[PDB]
Amino acid sequence: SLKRVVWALCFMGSLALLALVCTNRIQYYFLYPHVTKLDEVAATRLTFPAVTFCNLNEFRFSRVTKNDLYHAGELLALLNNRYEIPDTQTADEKQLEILQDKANFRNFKPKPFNMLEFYDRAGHDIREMLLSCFFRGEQCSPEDFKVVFTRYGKCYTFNAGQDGKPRLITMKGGTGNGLEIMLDIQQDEYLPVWGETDETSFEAGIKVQIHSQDEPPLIDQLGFGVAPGFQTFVSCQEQRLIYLPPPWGDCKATTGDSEFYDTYSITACRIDCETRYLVENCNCRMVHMPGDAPYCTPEQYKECADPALDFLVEKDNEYCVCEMPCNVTRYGKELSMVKIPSKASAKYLAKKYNKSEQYIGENILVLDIFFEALNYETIEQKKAYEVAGLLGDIGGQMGLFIGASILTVLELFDYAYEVIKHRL
Amino acid sequence: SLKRVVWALCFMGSLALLALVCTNRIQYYFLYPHVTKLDEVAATRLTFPAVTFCNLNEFRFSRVTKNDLYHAGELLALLNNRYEIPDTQTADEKQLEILQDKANFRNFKPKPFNMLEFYDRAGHDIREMLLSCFFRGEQCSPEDFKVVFTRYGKCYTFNAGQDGKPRLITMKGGTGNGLEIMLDIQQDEYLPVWGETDETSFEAGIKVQIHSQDEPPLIDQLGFGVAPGFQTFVSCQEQRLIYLPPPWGDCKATTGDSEFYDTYSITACRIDCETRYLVENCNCRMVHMPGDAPYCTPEQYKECADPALDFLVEKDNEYCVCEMPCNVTRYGKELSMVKIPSKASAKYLAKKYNKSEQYIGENILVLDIFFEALNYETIEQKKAYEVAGLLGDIGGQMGLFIGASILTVLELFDYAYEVIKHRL
Amino acid sequence: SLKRVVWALCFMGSLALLALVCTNRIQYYFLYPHVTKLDEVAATRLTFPAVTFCNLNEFRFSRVTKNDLYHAGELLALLNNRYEIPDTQTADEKQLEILQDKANFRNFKPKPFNMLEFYDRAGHDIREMLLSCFFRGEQCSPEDFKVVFTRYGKCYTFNAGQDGKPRLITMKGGTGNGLEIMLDIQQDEYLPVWGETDETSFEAGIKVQIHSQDEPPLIDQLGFGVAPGFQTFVSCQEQRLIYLPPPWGDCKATTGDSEFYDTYSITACRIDCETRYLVENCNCRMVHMPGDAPYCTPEQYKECADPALDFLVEKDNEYCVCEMPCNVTRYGKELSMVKIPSKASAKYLAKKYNKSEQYIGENILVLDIFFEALNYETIEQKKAYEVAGLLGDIGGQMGLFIGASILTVLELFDYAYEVIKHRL
Ligand SMILES: *[C@@H]1O[C@H](CO)[C@@H](O)[C@H](O)[C@H]1NC(C)=O
Ligand SMILES: *[C@@H]1O[C@H](CO)[C@@H](O)[C@H](O)[C@H]1NC(C)=O
Ligand SMILES: *[C@@H]1O[C@H](CO)[C@@H](O)[C@H](O)[C@H]1NC(C)=O
């Protein structure tokens, strides 16, 4: 009886250890773990990304009118609260006299107003910004950019891909085979800053955001700055990330049928959620937001929409729920600078563009964007432990400890069935 | 006999292959492999990191005295070896006459000295550096910084979290919802550099290190530079790395009860090990090192402590053994620049701060630190092959090749036990 | 009969599920998946990488001759098509009169020419560039650099490791324990740019590429720019990547016996493939390409070799097939800037180097390269699913569902063999 009892106790301990590691692997499985696969796939044809940039000015000074104050000088830091010029201590002569010429406001008939007219006309001409465009050694045109509207205002996009245009591709690396543009930020047309404000942008330069053709730009939250007086080499590395759907990951695996973007991205969910909340509140929308809804005369931006953004970012954080898409494609960047002009390259530019050497020194940048090498990194989340390997590990453990199988369990049911006649 | 012999030879080869792949998986297991899990977890509340910065000057020139030479001009590149001014060829008039006014050294009674008095008084006032502080659009105060002492000297920290203060959080991305500070590096108060030295810092600007509230700053080895004349956008990405303990990884999994830091980090182990070695050697410690031990009058820094650092970094590399902690939180950064001021924003600053336009051109920077997006990357080392999957794979292999189990092995012992009576 | 039939149907369904998940794991196996292992290994001795830099000028102006035009002014943007000066509108006086002095071309005997003589003599002296070299606080020498030839021309390399020199190592982090060099890009010696060109480099500064001693530099496609007037801190992080051979990965696992590089890299395959294609075409090679083949008088570069590069990059993309090597070692970099000189450090430099303060303001940079910390990241592709775990999972599944083994299959063959006598 004793040796059989020892055999039985070893069977009990073996079954208990089997149950322990089996629960270990089950509890491992229902965490749905996932691991990371990195890759560096070289390829010949690479889609050159969409470049987007805003000048740090919202709008030029010479292209506003007494109209454009009289509706819109309230929000845009040009009036007082009682419709007059703010404290203009130590101002330039003609700079103040043109503004005071606009600041009569006497017997003024109003004009039927929109913010989109103002951001169209008072903004920057790209034909007065784009000095020299180059792409793969071929001269590109100012009409090849695309106008968008951001929080900064009228902004531009190269290689947008929209309006049926083919996405531009590169065939070689290096700084010569990229986008090489020469821009003039036009510091003579910046806003008068004799008023005091907490958001008074003392800086000068450009803000550039690199993004795919998929997503709309989000320059306020994603872009990087580029100063004038420097050619800026921007090394780019394409990264094709693939995430996972839930339970494993967090992907909006659907097509993402948003109201205003047929394609889906993380920024599109953001901008459409904030759009939808504002159209819910103030019956009209901001200029950087799409919609069939109208825009508002600018009292309703500082009166209605801005505190809706404040309670939206503060208290209504649950009102926007955005899942990251699966096949995201980002662009790593590496910024480096060289100074421009030289002591030899100055006088040619000054003769060429009819400006002073001071103007060339403090008003021109050269944005230079190119891939470092013709390869894209691939960051995929692989499912670490599928149901098949679960069945393999459980079956291996049950093969080791008890040695039984599902056939053995079913014949155990049949052996109980032959014992079931004794109970009845 | 033949068919049974073939069955036996196939059993032998099957057992040998089983032993081969079993040794393959065992040798795989005792390497303790581990793989990488990347994640991008979005969240609403993010702890804004601790910002720390040193001006590149060690101490202002106007706040030193004939005292401060007479003890301390030896180490601090202001005396000769025989207590006189070094070679001051092509010096400014009053700049040299004030130093020579300090350089009489005639009938000088000494003064009871410390290095901490000198770095307190001769350093930079933060109230004479911090022009405008902003955080989330709310104006922060100069009293909200914290004074620390580094190798560069008196340095400052925003959002330190110490002295029971709550760690500051952000609720939105973009450059407006971050830390926006305007600083004056005060190039008029830099050191006279008419002496020659190999460590003669010809540069000018600020050095900034971003770190968690956990670790003390290590600006000499971790910080990045920021030049004046540029608003510098600093994109930040929080990364929560989780490593593994040994055998798998290299983690000090304990609480790390260091003598001078209750919390544990890699920099704390470094600074306490170097502290402990110096308190072992020179009976007193440097200013950037904590301790209950005193400091030294500056002959003992260039006489005792510096070659202890030299043999410490060179020969005593085994005297400091620092393991990286488990749940490290780093901050990826991306630097971009825009130029400041504009041609419009100059005269307002010059009127505002009572300085020349040259002063604004070459003396002011704007440090701008913000998260790119409200998400933190997660780099975890998962154990690749635990003991449970080991038992599963071994049990699966033994289920395939020989088909036996541990029950079969124990009954093989019992079958030998029934054969054990034949031997005795 | 019924209960046996139910046992048989459960055996059929169990066998079918077994076949399903078995095909799932086989199809998983022949994808050869691989996952990523990240590591951060700290170590004392780190090999300091090879630094390479080109001035953005190809060659100095004062070191060319009427010779050097008369052969070589055609390609090098100094002649017209009919051997005369291009449009020199708004030129400096002596700058144009020296060129016109070279531009007589009257009764000119030619001179036996090479491009390597011209890039040797007309380029930049490193002894007229390297103002102050420092490494680990020890002054390095201008003879410790190494001359190479790139597309930019005569370029230099620190810590090249070639000619039997030991690779330099660092023992401490921080900006003091790295390479600290002070350079003068010499904007007075840049090319006259009164001619118009699409590749007219208006910029000024230096281009620096950090690389291992293994690979030759590829500065046109890999380097980053550094402007003058800034000390540039370059944080470096060593990364030892290990890829996999095919089928798993894409590695040239062999030694890579290229014709001109005994060691193998990705850039070596590129430069030797383009070399081999050009030696196939124009019987002589460019200067940035190695070879026993000669070089060409410069009509054959703009006549033969450049369109061979054009059809090479465009149509002959299949003519170069380069696999990435296994144990690649890259160097992550992080660029930050501080301004140099100060208002105190100017006059010492101007007295020291016999130049104006304007010269110091717009002609000197300080390249500063150092490791952030004494640790290297390790990005290894581990094989995710080897043949051993395949046998374990299949054996576990066959242990679960049918419970059979390979012994059971062989005894099934023997049971068929006992049934094989009934057929014959
Ligand atoms: C989305 O991912 C699939 C592969 O899973 C690919 O076919 C498609 O091109 C991806 N889309 C984008 C925009 O990258
Ligand atoms: C050049 O600029 C000056 C002043 O800006 C102007 O008077 C002149 O007409 C301009 N000439 C050309 C050709 O643009
Ligand atoms: C340390 O890691 C644990 C999770 O393993 C977490 O609870 C804790 O907040 C972490 N500490 C820090 C400082 O990140």
Ligand SMILES: *[C@@H]1O[C@H](CO)[C@@H](O)[C@H](O)[C@H]1NC(C)=O
């Ligand atoms: C402004 O600066 C000048 C010289 O620096 C000084 O004399 C004057 O008192 C200052 N005034 C104010 C209001 O700070």
Ligand SMILES: *[C@@H]1O[C@H](CO)[C@@H](O)[C@H](O)[C@H]1NC(C)=O
């Ligand atoms: C190549 O990798 C092996 C380890 O697999 C190592 O011994 C060798 O040093 C590596 N070579 C280089 C140049 O990193």
Ligand SMILES: *[C@@H]1O[C@H](CO)[C@@H](O)[C@H](O)[C@H]1NC(C)=O
């Ligand atoms: C300094 O430079 C001037 C002009 O460049 C020259 O005449 C003089 O000889 C130089 N002196 C020395 C000592 O280099």
